[PDB]
């Protein structure tokens, strides 16, 4: 019938359209395309922060926990959002970074980062195969913000665990909206959470690309800074399987 209140609340705090400030009425160069993406990334970061403060439970956490979670989640959140837009607007056939920045297959190949494109393109394809709902996407997204904590843990550890548990229950409610039956629901939950778990690996790849693209545009200080985001055993991932 109706949509659960929390999920409806999630829909209403979804960030509105963010343009890249890209001119499509003129051919792109390797310089302008990368410049457009960085500008979009900066704008999307401020949006992630603004979105997190409207998230029930997030403000209860110590300011230091809030910072940490965003540091360990911005990449995942950005590529997951890209996955959703590409899925909804163009059936996952191309990368919908923004309304004024859509990369089709032929353009991805001509670029100097087709490999990265194929990696990111994995998500929209998965959304198509699973036929993910908006309600499911919204709950999964919050779970990404709460999927990695430091080895020592957080200051508001108990408050965090409770928040994580609430959104897990919400995802189950989202699934229940269409999956009627305990066997089908259980099977759906496994598929969606398996997808969430796989993002831990995929995101390390994106961080490496970012680190390698930096090196190419320009020493041990730079390496050491990003290492914790590409290497295993540095942080504590929260896996469902």
């Amino acid at each position: 019938q109706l949509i659960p209140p929390l999920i409806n609340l999630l829909m209403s705090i979804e960030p509105d359209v963010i343009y890249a400030g890209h001119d499509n009425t003129k051919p792109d160069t390797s310089s302008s395309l990368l410049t457009s993406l960085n500008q979009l990334g900066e704008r999307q970061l401020l949006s992630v922060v603004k979105w997190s403060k409207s998230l029930p439970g997030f403000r209860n956490l110590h300011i230091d926990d809030q910072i940490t979670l965003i540091q360990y989640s911005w990449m995942s959140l950005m590529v997951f959002g890209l996955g959703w837009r590409s899925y909804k607007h163009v059936s996952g056939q191309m990368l919908y970074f923004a309304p004024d920045l859509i990369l089709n297959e032929q353009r991805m190949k001509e670029s100097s980062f087709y490999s990265l494109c194929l990696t990111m393109w994995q998500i929209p394809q998965e959304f198509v195969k699973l036929q993910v709902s908006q309600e499911e996407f919204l709950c999964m997204k919050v779970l990404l913000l709460l999927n990695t904590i430091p080895l020592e843990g957080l200051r508001s550890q108990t408050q965090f665990e409770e928040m994580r548990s609430s959104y897990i229950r919400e995802l189950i409610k989202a699934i229940g909206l269409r999956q009627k039956g305990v066997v089908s629901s259980s099977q759906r939950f496994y598929q969606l959470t398996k997808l969430l778990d796989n993002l831990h690996d995929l995101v390390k790849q994106l961080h490496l690309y970012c680190l390698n693209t930096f090196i190419q545009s320009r020493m041990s200080e730079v390496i050491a800074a990003q290492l914790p985001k590409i290497l295993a055993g540095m942080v504590k991932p929260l896996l469902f399987h």
Binding site: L45, L46, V49, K53, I63, Q66, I67, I70, Q71, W74
Partner: peptide, 11 residues
């Protein structure tokens, strides 16, 4: 300088 930006944005 992301940590700084994230912190200022949160406040």
């Amino acid at each position: 300088g992301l940590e700084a930006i994230i912190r200022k944005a949160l406040m």
